[PDB]
């Protein structure tokens, strides 16, 4: 039910977004034609009293009215797009909140990652479309132009929503467990390797810049990661299998026994389309036994 | 500072969500969940345009203000207040003004109750308009701003604007923006002392503004009211969030309202039989309506009918898909479709047809009488009147000639050709002829329809918002029999009358203009007249009736009967939307011009010639005063006609109502007394402002054309017509309605795609567009269909052979002004209209527009031609 609703929502959003793209293109052609007509009128340089001059100025005003009608038509459709889009994220949010509840208590992720990737693609393409719309309208921006604030508020809202989504987009797929004895999870032993797995719900990554993920842990029994805490994922890996991180050799050393727990922290630096955001997440609490 | 300043600062210091939730904290709302989407579908009744209608209803219901008589509206915008006021009982006329433009509200048309009393104006600035007489004044102008000083300045400017219009006994309702500072209170005190009133808040108003209104029937104090409003606003943001109290929207109904004044008297002894017959035919549903919106026309009754007509018009698909880059030009799309629904017909009839003129004085009457007598004696020097017969009319109808606007009486027959062969039609015609011979008419009625009701269409469709008069076939035949000789004998040809240009093709008026501009005198003047068809008075008809003095016998009797019983005594049917459905009314009038197309053309040419001669008379100073003409002036004016009267007629060129005059002295522009007195008021110019002339003959507009000149490669010189390309392209994409097929539309497209190859061959963007159409139509088909230019009686491009031979025959062999007769044998020796001039006249070449006119060329046009489908064709490019 929820998945089918999500599919219908994304389908209708794609349809009306294609319609919006067509409208933007048509407005671009109309603006170009008007600019050419004004240019050729200006280079004429014929100041006088003539019915033709009175005729051409009247039709010039009508062109300006149509440009405003087209320009104002883009915003509300974009505004309506944002309102409907904002419903999907808050509806998809508990699907992840309830997802981690089962882990604490089949564990497929394909639907969630596909939905998150689709949402990220929609957000990024909407941001690019707004950017090119602003660049187009900056040429002949004039008095009484609602775009000069509307586009900025739309970009602000889009950036805020994207940041909010990517704040929760980071989850830990697998808790650190030893491969030798998988019977007991969420338990740590000194001088041994541990296997962890983390996945990021959006399958988007630049093909020229690698993705960097760092890790961190936590007089309590403080422990330090003897092995390397840094890893690099090849850009082709995201296309081949996804943004998959595997640390199968992490070890911990020591610088009543079970009274307090330790938390391992994950930090990722996300860079795409000129926007950089800092993310931090925590794993399930664990206890170290010697 | 006062408490209002504290409240404003506190509201300024707030969050987004808190601001959004503060808007609705006890105010009242109206459910607009129906009216909006009703308007989007296209409804024009039972709806409110905006939200101010509810506020105005709240004010009026408690009789705070009681508008009456004439009401003036400032900054109406869409016009909810004006539309609501129009439906009231004591309102007699509504006038409203608003400042249109980018990012501003604009009026839109509705058909609510009493919609025929409201007139709205756009694109006018209120601050620079002289005050006029008014009985009730409404003002709702104001824009919020975070800064208080600018709001105070705006309020002071508004008050300074409004203080002039108010009188002692005028009702008012004025909005004040920011009333909580002394910089407005000190003026408000004086205003209230001088005129009275109070400041009251509307509960429907939002919670985010401190707006107040100034009314008429109230009293109190200002500062205490502002303080208590501020205290209430302060207390408001302390309770819980209460749901908005929803109130249903207003419904206005529909219909038309009558004012109750009439200024016309009927002649029952002439039209009684026609009225009786019409009433007897539809006795079942005959009723009297008390809401007829006619003022200068009589009323007789109304019956029931079925609605005909449809908004917008069909679009020729064959020409479309070929002119792809033209779908974005606003002119092409806007003028494409018009309105012919009963609402549009009523709008046109109210706007233009229903007018009134004034009688002239004695001197002008005598002048036009003398001039008309002399002109009639002059024209009939080498021609004699005669009578037409039935064989000529049968040949005319059989060949589908340029017949006038006529319905083929569909109730019994299906077309004119089917009815001509029958005998009952001729029996009815003979009976009506016998009745007419005794000075009675019984079956002579008209029909009416409207067109061209959009914004930008009227600026590119000849003269827009017209009205054509249909007639029965028998009356058409009788009128032809009476007065066919005026056109069948070419009475108004250039050879007979030295001014008319009837019978001359479109490709020959430039030579005439060039020949005219070779004389000696001042400059060329090309003034026009607005609504010429409605400026004809009874005196002009009486003057034109003086042609019967050359007739005799039965011909004279028939001509007199036709002139007397039809042209100045008319009965017209018209439709009108009503709540009960659709109805038809019958009206009458004496003046104005309603007849067949050719007869109207001839009479208009004659009247224009007489008027131009009179104006040239006044320019030379032959007579001084027009109030009264005395002796020693009649002799003087008659000597002028005899001496050089003939020569002076050779300086002009009058096709219809279009005139071009080259006077001897520039005193022509300053003589505007007789012309204004006769009733031919000029267009878009001040009444007493002198007219503007031209010193060049290549820019004078005649028949909506500017005539350039061209130079061939050899050296020969031609003269070609020209026009704005956008208008031609927009016309070319409209189907007249004779289609419902592919063969018909293809034939029409091929028919008027050859006009461009014939006349408009000199421009790059139009010659190429015709080759594609000729190469897409499967050829072998006769391109027979009426395209346009009914006045121009050539229609020569309807042939079938190759266009090169036709061009050589037309522009070389039959050219009197061309000396040598060496023909051409290719399409490459014909030159173009320069390069910059083509762009100036409206092309799309030479600049960034060439980047979008880059796919509609031979680079990517072959696929477009092949896109037609299985319909074969033959290449021609
Ligand atoms: Zn009659
Ligand atoms: Zn031109």
Automatic annotation (TrEMBL), chain B:
Residue ranges of every copy of the MRNA cap 0-1 NS5-type MT domain listed in the record: 1-258
The organism of origin for this protein: Dengue virus type 2
Residues annotated for S-adenosyl-L-homocysteine 2 binding in this entry: 50, 125-126
Sorted UniProt keywords: Acetylation, Activation of host autophagy by virus, ATP-binding, Capsid protein, Clathrin-mediated endocytosis of virus by host, Cleavage on pair of basic residues, Disulfide bond, Fusion of virus membrane with host endosomal membrane, Fusion of virus membrane with host membrane, Glycoprotein, Helicase, Host endoplasmic reticulum, Host membrane, Host mitochondrion, Host nucleus, Host-virus interaction, Hydrolase, Inhibition of host innate immune response by virus, Inhibition of host interferon signaling pathway by virus, Inhibition of host MAVS by virus, Inhibition of host RLR pathway by virus, Inhibition of host STAT2 by virus, Inhibition of host TYK2 by virus, Interferon antiviral system evasion, Ion channel, Ion transport, Membrane, Metal-binding, Methyltransferase, mRNA capping, mRNA processing, Multifunctional enzyme, Nucleotide-binding, Nucleotidyltransferase, Phosphoprotein, Protease, RNA-binding, RNA-directed RNA polymerase, S-adenosyl-L-methionine, Secreted, Serine protease, Transcription, Transcription regulation, Transferase, Transmembrane, Transmembrane helix, Transport, Viral attachment to host cell, Viral envelope protein, Viral immunoevasion, Viral ion channel, Viral penetration into host cytoplasm, Viral RNA replication, Virion, Virus endocytosis by host, Virus entry into host cell, Zinc
Residues that, per the record, bind Zn(2+) 2: 706, 708, 722, 841
Name of the featured protein: Genome polyprotein
Ranges of residues in domain RdRp catalytic: 522-671
Subcellular location: Host endoplasmic reticulum membrane; Host mitochondrion; Host nucleus; Secreted
Binding of CTP, residues: 466, 531-533, 604, 683
Binding site for S-adenosyl-L-methionine: 50, 80-81, 98-99, 125-126, 213
Record's subunit section: Homodimer; in the endoplasmic reticulum and Golgi. Interacts with protein prM. Interacts with non-structural protein 1. Interacts (via N-terminus) with serine protease NS3.
Residues involved in Mg(2+) 1 binding: 528-529, 657
Binding sites annotated in the UniProt record for Zn(2+) 1: 432, 436, 441, 444
An annotated GO BP: symbiont-mediated activation of host autophagy
Example of a GO cellular component annotation carried by this entry: host cell nucleus
UniProt keyword Hydrolase present: yes
Keyword Secreted: yes
Binding annotation for S-adenosyl-L-homocysteine 1: 50, 81, 125-126
Annotated function: Regulates the ATPase activity of the NS3 helicase activity. NS4A allows NS3 helicase to conserve energy during unwinding. Plays a role in the inhibition of the host innate immune response. Interacts with host MAVS and thereby prevents the interaction between RIGI and MAVS. In turn, IFN-beta production is impaired. Interacts with host AUP1 which mediates induction of lipophagy in host cells and facilitates production of virus progeny particles.
Residues reported in the UniProt entry to bind Mg(2+) 2: 528, 658
GO MF assignments: ATP binding; channel activity; double-stranded RNA binding; lipid binding; metal ion binding; methyltransferase cap1 activity; mRNA 5'-cap (guanine-N7-)-methyltransferase activity; protein dimerization activity
